[PDB]
Amino acid sequence: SGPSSPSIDQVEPYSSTAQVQFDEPEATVPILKYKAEWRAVGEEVWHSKWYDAKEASMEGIVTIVGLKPETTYAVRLAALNGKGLGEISAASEFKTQPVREPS
Numbered sequence: 410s411g412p413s414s415p416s417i418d419q420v421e422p423y424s425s426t427a428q429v430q431f432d433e434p435e436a437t438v439p440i441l442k443y444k445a446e447w448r449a450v451g452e453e454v455w456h457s458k459w460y461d462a463k464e465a466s467m468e469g470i471v472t473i474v475g476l477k478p479e480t481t482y483a484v485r486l487a488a489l490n491g492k493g494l495g496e497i498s499a500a501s502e503f504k505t506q507p508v509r510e511p512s
Contacts, residue, residue, distance in 0.1 A: 410492060410493050410495070411487075411488065411489065411490060411492055411493045411494050411495025411496065412433070412434070412440050412488040412489070412490045412492075412495040413433070413434055413488070413495060413496070414486070414487060414488070414495060414496045414497060414498040414499070415431040415432065415433045415443065415469075415486040415487070415488055415498045416431055416432050416433075416498060416499075417429055417430070417431045417484065417485070417486060417498055417499075417501035418430050418431055418432055418469075420484065420501060420502075420503040422476075422503040422504060422505045422506060423505065423506055424476075424478040424505055424506045424507060424508045424509060425474065425475065425476050425477070425478060425505065426472055426473065426474045426475075426476060426505075427447075427472070427473045427476060427482070427484070427503050427505065428470055428471075428472050429445065429470065429471050429472070429473060429484055429486065429501075429503075430468065430469055430470050431469050431470075431471075431486055431498070432469055433469065433488055436490075438490050438491055438492065439462070439490065440462040440466075440488045440489065440490050441462050441489050441490055441491065442459055442460060442461060442462050442488075442489040443459070443460045443462060443465050443471055443486055443487065443488055443489070444457055444458070444459050444460070444486070444487045444488075444489065444494065445457065445458050445460065445471045445473060445484065445485070445486050446484070446485050446486075446487075446497070447473050447476075447482045447483065447484040447485075448482060448483050449477065449480050449481065449482050450480065450481040450482070458471075458473065462488070462489075471486065476505050477505065478505050478506065478507050478508050479504070479505060479506070479507050480504065480505050481502060481503070481504045482502060482503055482504075482505070483500040483501070483502050484500065484501050484502065484503065485497050485498045485499065485500045485501070486498045
C-alpha cells in the first residue's frame with residue numbers, strides 16, 4: 410500500500426520557514442514523492458505540500474514555507490511510491506523564530 414513512514418529527526422525553524430529532516434529506508438520500487446503536513450497550535454486543519462523524492466533525498470529534507478513567526482507547529486511526513494502513499498509519520502513539532510533583527 411506504500412513505503413514505511415519517515416522518521417523526523419531534526420527540524421531547523423526560521424521565522425516563516427522550517428527545514429524538516431527525516432530518515433527513510435533505502436529503496437529496495439523507489440520512493441517517488443513525500444507529503445508533509447503541518448498545523449499550528451490552535452488549528453484543526455492540517456496544511457500539506459508535496460515534495461519530489463529525488464530532490465529531498467540529498468539531505469532527507471523538506472522545507473515548509475509560509476509559516477507564522479513565534480508559532481508552534483506539529484509536523485508529519487508520508488512517503489509515496491508506485492504502490493501508493495504510505496503511513497504518515499509520528500508528529501514532530503517546532504516553534505518558528507521571531508523575525509530576525511535586520512543586520
